[PDB]
Design a protein around this ligand. Structure first.
Ligand SMILES: [Au+]
Ligand SMILES: [Au+]
Ligand SMILES: [Au+]
Ligand SMILES: [Au+]
Ligand SMILES: [Au+]
Ligand SMILES: [Au+]
Ligand SMILES: [Au+]
Length: 526
């Protein structure tokens, strides 16, 4: 039995730019469209024509935690996504909307593998379980028939960080903290071999068309070539002076593109390792890369890092630089830059247990109101640690919420255990009521009431509006999730009115919330 937590995000109606690093990239050459999977929990669509003042197309927001991987199938018609919210989501990629949500995984969904030819896709995570999926079966799901037959892969002892399938979908390999790679036949689900060789966790896997050989990059700093025939590591290339997290290959399976912690991007000739071209040196560790496959040799490479900015680097002059060459990079500046937003990297809950001070990646300090789920002031580039001090309030209020910053935005979480703990005077809370004054308001209560304001159940029946003090921004996402893991339901505050929304709120809203919002049984103060 898992308890349920109500959480919300303090953000704007629209987040045009990534508010954290990008985990996964997916390029549509047909429509010149890029897909960025964000740690900000939002997938975004961009136009990569190169000549446009603003490349922003749309943003897909259903996920409640990091978006770890994305897969663009059916000639760019469908998008499958993997998230730390424990779910896999099917999206109409052309029109940009959510279609189905697979809640089969019990923990973070870390990677996706794709068999272009057989139109198959697999998902693995910290579950230690891999799930195979037919894309056509997924594309025809949500309605009256949400019937899902789960085809799993067994063996993984540890948490999965990488997945790869060959074009034909005859081979499937997993990478984990077990250091060892496990191979299977995706069509039969049968175990093939268990390849031993790596020293650390494998964050990047790559397979050739026929699935005869596999390329792997591990946190040990090496790229390893494997023969699935010979059933072992046929070669080892030490390319990076630290962890290697992202790999890409040409169609020949001869030139490998790599990046990871050391920020350097390299093309390395597997045939002649001597030939190793430094494409560029990024401003943050490389998390994922996506080659432009419009031409052979690939004309450009799209690069995702720890930063919010996404870049394209031209590979146009490699061959000419290869014949004619203190390590000088091919590129110094990116060909195309997709702009990024700021991430809140430091936060301080003030002594009143209502105000929050934050510092972001641009060094901008800002004051926030948790209870009214909003920003209050932008203090600018003030000294943050001095600001924390300046704003010392000599008061005590019990902790009634937790804070997370894994999206680069403020996410507040309420738990049954301490949601109602903070009892403050109305005059104190800045809620002057002249002159039938100073009642003792419960902060967590009022906040819950404001969050579920548009829920009709919280008005009247009878069983024979708001909280009365404030309103939360109506676009405020209200998330319902198991404390242990699984995210249950995400809706906007303003959407609680809708009949199908209210129907879902009725099944997910836990009792501890029903008591105060619906039953109006406000807690007792002593
Ligand atoms: Au398809
Ligand atoms: Au959905
Ligand atoms: Au080796
Ligand atoms: Au190359
Ligand atoms: Au090369
Ligand atoms: Au924080
Ligand atoms: Au904090």
């Amino acid at each position: 039995r898992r308890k349920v937590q109500v959480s919300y995000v303090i953000r704007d109606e629209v987040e045009k730019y990534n508010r954290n690093g990008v985990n996964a990239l997916q390029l549509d050459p047909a429509l010149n469209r890029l897909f960025t999977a964000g740690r900000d929990s939002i997938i975004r669509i961009w136009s990569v024509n190169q000549h446009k003042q603003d490349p922003y197309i749309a943003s897909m927001e259903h996920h409640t935690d990091w978006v770890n991987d994305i897969v663009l199938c059916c000639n760019g018609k469908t998008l499958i996504s993997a998230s730390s919210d424990t779910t896999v989501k099917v999206w109409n990629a052309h029109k940009g909307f959510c279609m189905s949500t697979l809640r089969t995984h019990k923990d973070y969904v870390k990677a996706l593998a794709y068999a272009k030819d057989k139109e198959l896709v697999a998902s693995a995570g910290l579950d230690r379980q891999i799930f195979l999926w037919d894309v056509n079966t997924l594309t025809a799901l949500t309605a009256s028939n949400n019937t899902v037959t789960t085809s799993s892969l067994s063996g993984n002892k540890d948490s999965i960080y990488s997945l790869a399938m060959n074009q034909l979908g005859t081979i499937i390999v997993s990478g984990s903290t077990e250091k060892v790679l496990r191979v299977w036949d995706p069509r039969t689900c049968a175990k093939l071999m268990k390849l031993k060789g790596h020293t650390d966790n494998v964050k990047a896997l790559l397979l050739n068309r026929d699935g005869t050989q596999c390329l792997s990059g591990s946190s040990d700093g090496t790229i390893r070539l494997w023969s699935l025939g010979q059933q072992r590591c046929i070669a080892t290339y030490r390319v990076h002076d630290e962890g290697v997290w992202a790999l890409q290959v040409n169609d020949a399976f001869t030139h490998v593109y790599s990046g990871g912690r050391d920020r350097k991007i390299y093309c390395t000739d597997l045939r002649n390792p001597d030939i190793r071209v430094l494409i560029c040196e990024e401003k943050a560790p490389v998390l994922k890369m996506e080659l432009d496959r419009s031409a052979d040799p690939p004309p450009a490479i799209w690069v995702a890092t720890t930063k919010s900015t996404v870049n394209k680097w031209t590979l146009k002059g490699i061959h000419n630089f290869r014949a004619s060459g203190p390590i000088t990079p091919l590129c110094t500046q990116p060909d195309q830059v997709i702009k990024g937003g700021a991430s809140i990297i430091q936060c301080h809950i003030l002594n009143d247990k209502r105000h929050i001070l934050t510092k972001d990646t641009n060094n901008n300090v800002a004051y926030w109101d948790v209870l009214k789920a909003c920003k209050v002031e932008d203090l600018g580039k003030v000294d943050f640690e001095d600001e924390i001090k300046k704003r010392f309030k000599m008061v005590y209020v019990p902790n009634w919420f937790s804070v997370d910053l894994k999206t680069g935005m403020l996410t507040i979480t309420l738990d049954e255990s301490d949601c109602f703990a903070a009892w403050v005077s109305a005059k104190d809370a800045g809620f002057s009521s002249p002159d039938g004054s100073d009642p003792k308001l419960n902060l967590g209560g009022l906040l819950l009431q404001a969050l579920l304001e548009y829920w009709p159940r919280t008005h009247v029946n009878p069983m024979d509006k708001g909280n009365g003090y404030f309103q939360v921004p109506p676009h405020t996402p209200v998330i319902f999730g198991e404390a242990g893991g699984r995210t249950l339901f995400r809706l906007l505050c303003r959407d609680s009115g809708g009949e199908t929304e209210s129907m879902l709120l009725n099944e997910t809203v836990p009792q501890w919330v029903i008591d105060i919002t619906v039953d109006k049984n406000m807690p007792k103060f002593n």
